[PDB]
């Protein structure tokens, strides 16, 4: 097993569990944050066929399951299913006892504090961790950059952040939160695939559409001329073989899916877009911070592996920011993992080991200790 007391870094954003140990390059366990459950009856007698499938096994059996994400927009909705996800995380995937390891959880800013508080209650009461710490996810995404100055966009499966930090000091009044992320892009892609002719409605078919979004989507630097480019010829069409047979061929849907991220009116969501929430987070900072946020604009979570989103990102923030400013969009190709990687850095720091919310301090101050020790 693990012969030491190495800290656990568990990172469930809203749609993908990535967990592992501190002082480590990559997360050891990366699996979908789903719990599946059979929706019709078992007939082969003597089969096993447990009435819950968590993680990657659920995508192995998703044709006979109703898949259900226990965490939506960064908020944990099903608590017993999230306990299934954590139980599978420690005991099956990462294959370790939580009693021996301090654990580092992550969440978004501007979240309900009962998420953080009940997450601490489940970590100490159910899994009996010795220490525990919730961490703001974009902050950790700046720990992976090796920077102490920068504004961080990450955009996981349920939430996007823009946390600005200058010289180690965060600017929590200048913080942002938009609930437009990759599951919303998956749903919008599923809608416009219904526009082309392909009907995906099941949760398993939603997982297929999510795969189409990951394999086969880019961001379109200039959306109008890319739109007319797809309207002119079929040079942007691309085929995807569905599981078990039929192939599909998608055109302008390839780049209309993450244009919703730059233009949230497509999914009917009144917002300013990703590029304007970055600029508005920078303009909420003080005057002497802003060029150090322009040159350090870290873009480091999931749903940013769309090809060209750093080009669209710089191309649009440059149009908002004044001239003679140096707009550098940092898009480090190890992102989708850098919230975990910065979790690994922070949990492996030696200054940090008196910042763990420990037990006998949880037992002393109840579950509200998180609002005086964590942030």
């Amino acid at each position: 097993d693990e012969d030491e007391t190495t800290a656990l870094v568990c990172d469930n954003g809203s749609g993908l569990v990535k967990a592992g140990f501190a002082g480590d390059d990559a997360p050891r366990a990366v699996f979908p944050s789903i719990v599946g459950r059979p929706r019709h009856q078992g007939v082969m007698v003597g089969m096993g066929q447990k009435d819950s499938y968590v993680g990657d096994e659920a995508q192995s059996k998703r044709g006979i399951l109703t898949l259900k994400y226990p965490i939506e927009h960064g908020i944990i909705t099903n608590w017993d299913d999230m306990e299934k996800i954590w139980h599978h995380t420690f005991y099956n995937e990462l294959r370790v006892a939580p009693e021996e390891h301090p654990t580092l959880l992550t969440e978004a800013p501007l979240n309900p504090k009962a998420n953080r508080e009940k997450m601490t209650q489940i970590m100490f009461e159910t899994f009996n961790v010795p220490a525990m710490y919730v961490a703001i996810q974009a902050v950790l995404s700046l720990y992976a950059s090796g920077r102490t100055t920068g504004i961080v966009l990450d955009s996981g499966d349920g939430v996007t952040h823009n946390v600005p930090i200058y010289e180690g000091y965060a600017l929590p009044h200048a913080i942002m939160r938009l609930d437009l992320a990759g599951r919303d892009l998956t749903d919008y892609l599923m809608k416009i695939l219904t526009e082309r002719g392909y009907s995906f409605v099941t949760t398993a078919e939603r997982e297929i559409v999510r795969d189409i979004k990951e394999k086969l989507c880019y961001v379109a630097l200039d959306f109008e001329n890319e739109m007319a480019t797809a309207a002119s010829s079929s040079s942007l069409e691309k085929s995807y073989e569905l599981p078990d047979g039929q192939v599909i061929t998608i055109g302008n849907e390839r780049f209309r899916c993450p244009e919703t991220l730059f233009q949230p009116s497509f999914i009917g969501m009144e917002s300013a877009g990703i590029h304007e929430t970055t600029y508005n987070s920078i303009m909420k900072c003080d005057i002497d911070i802003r060029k150090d946020l322009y040159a350090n604009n870290v873009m480091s979570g999931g749903t940013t592996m769309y090809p060209g989103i750093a080009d669209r990102m710089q191309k649009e923030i440059t149009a908002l920011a004044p001239s003679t400013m140096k707009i550098k969009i940092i898009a480090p190709p190890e992102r989708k993992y850098s919230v975990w990687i910065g979790g690994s850095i922070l949990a492996s720091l030696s200054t940090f080991q008196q910042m763990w919310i420990t037990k006998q301090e949880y037992d002393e101050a109840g579950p509200s200790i998180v609002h005086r020790k964590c942030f």
């Binding site: 990535k18 390059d25 102490t148 550098k328 969009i329 480090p332 200054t351």
Partner: protein, 364 residues
């Protein structure tokens, strides 16, 4: 020949900037030499891969990280060739058909390398001297005490200056000097050495023996004998003044997984045999231990190979540096008497005794 590789910046792609080698002739000749594919090792300096679960995505190093991977590959290749060499000497004379055996050992270890411009190396040297005096003051003095008290004589000898305070100064996992250097190499941001000395002034300098100039509660503030970018440590022998120049540059042992993974395919049955970490069937995901982890773990291995044994000491003294057989310089030997801790040794051995035996061979 690996040291001639020098790097230059390169802008694209925007974040982070690529380090690019300048002249590929030295790289081409060491790749011809070691029989490794040249673009594999060329990408092993600028890129390191991260690998979570069936993904192989490759990220970019800094130019300074490229010199750190260059130097880390060099000194790990050399240190590991040295260890393989000692192991190959070992497997000629090995205790075959291993049984319960007894060992008489000889430790050729240095003394206090106190140089006019001390560095990280003389810091580790003086540190394993601190652990070495701790394996005197633990083993020998405490077996004196359990012996003396156990044989029914009423002493508890007067006092000793314990070294657990100095070990607590350096090897502590939170308040140590090596631990704040491991921080310093894991810190985001500018990681220059003056921020390390500032960190030593901040939270390491509540200590009785850590003596710096610009510390928090600084008693040594008005002292011109302390310069800046330096710190004293009052050891048990005396005060040693350390330059912090090159300190954080020589902590760094960024031997990434792609350096060993590159050199695992590299030609020889030696360089392949040096690095089992470069096996793709051996997924070693941990970050590289820098030097406080490595040298401190090597000191802990030394202390594992000494606490099971009885020590008997040689204190070795040179008269002058000019290799003379007659000339006995007084000042250099008084230097060495002051820092080998000999008058304190004479004071401790005047506790009660100088000789002990059992009854029967003494009467015989």
């Amino acid at each position: 020949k690996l040291g001639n590789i020098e790097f230059k910046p390169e802008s694209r792609m925007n974040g982070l900037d690529e380090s690019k080698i300048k002249d590929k002739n030295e790289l081409k000749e060491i790749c011809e030499l070691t029989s490794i594919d040249q673009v594999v090792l060329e990408r092993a300096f600028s890129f390191r891969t991260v690998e979570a679960k069936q993904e192989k995505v490759s990220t970019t190093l800094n130019v300074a990280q490229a010199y750190y991977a260059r130097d880390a590959l060099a000194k790990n290749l050399y240190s590991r060739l040295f260890s393989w060499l000692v192991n190959r000497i070992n497997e000629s004379i090995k205790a075959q058909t291993k049984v319960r055996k007894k060992v008489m050992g000889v430790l050729d270890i240095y003394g206090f390398e106190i140089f006019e411009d001390n560095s990280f190396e003389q810091f580790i040297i003086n540190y394993c001297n601190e652990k070495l005096q701790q394996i005197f003051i633990e083993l020998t003095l405490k077996e004196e005490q359990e012996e003396y008290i156990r044989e029914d004589i009423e002493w508890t000898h007067i006092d000793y200056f314990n070294n657990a305070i100095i070990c607590d100064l350096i090897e502590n996992n939170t308040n140590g000097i090596l631990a704040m250097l491991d921080e310093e190499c894991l810190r985001p941001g500018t990681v220059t050495d003056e921020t390390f000395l500032e960190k030593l002034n901040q939270v390491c300098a509540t200590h009785q023996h850590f003596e710096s100039r610009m510390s928090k509660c600084s008693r040594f503030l008005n002292d011109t004998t302390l310069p800046h970018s330096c710190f004293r440590i009052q050891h048990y022998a005396g005060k040693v003044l350390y330059q912090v120049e090159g300190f954080v540059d020589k902590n760094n042992d960024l031997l990434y997984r792609d350096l060993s993974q590159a050199m695992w395919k590299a030609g020889h049955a030696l360089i392949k045999s040096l690095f089992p970490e470069g096996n793709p069937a051996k997924v070693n995901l941990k970050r590289p231990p820098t030097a406080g982890s490595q040298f401190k773990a090597s000191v802990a291995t030394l202390m594992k190979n000494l606490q099971t044994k009885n020590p008997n000491y040689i204190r070795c003294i040179k008269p002058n540096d000019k290799k003379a057989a007659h000339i006995f310089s007084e000042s250099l030997v008084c230097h060495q008497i002051r820092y080998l801790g000999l008058l304190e040794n004479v004071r401790v051995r005047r506790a009660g005794y100088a000789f002990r035996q059992a009854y029967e061979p003494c009467l015989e």
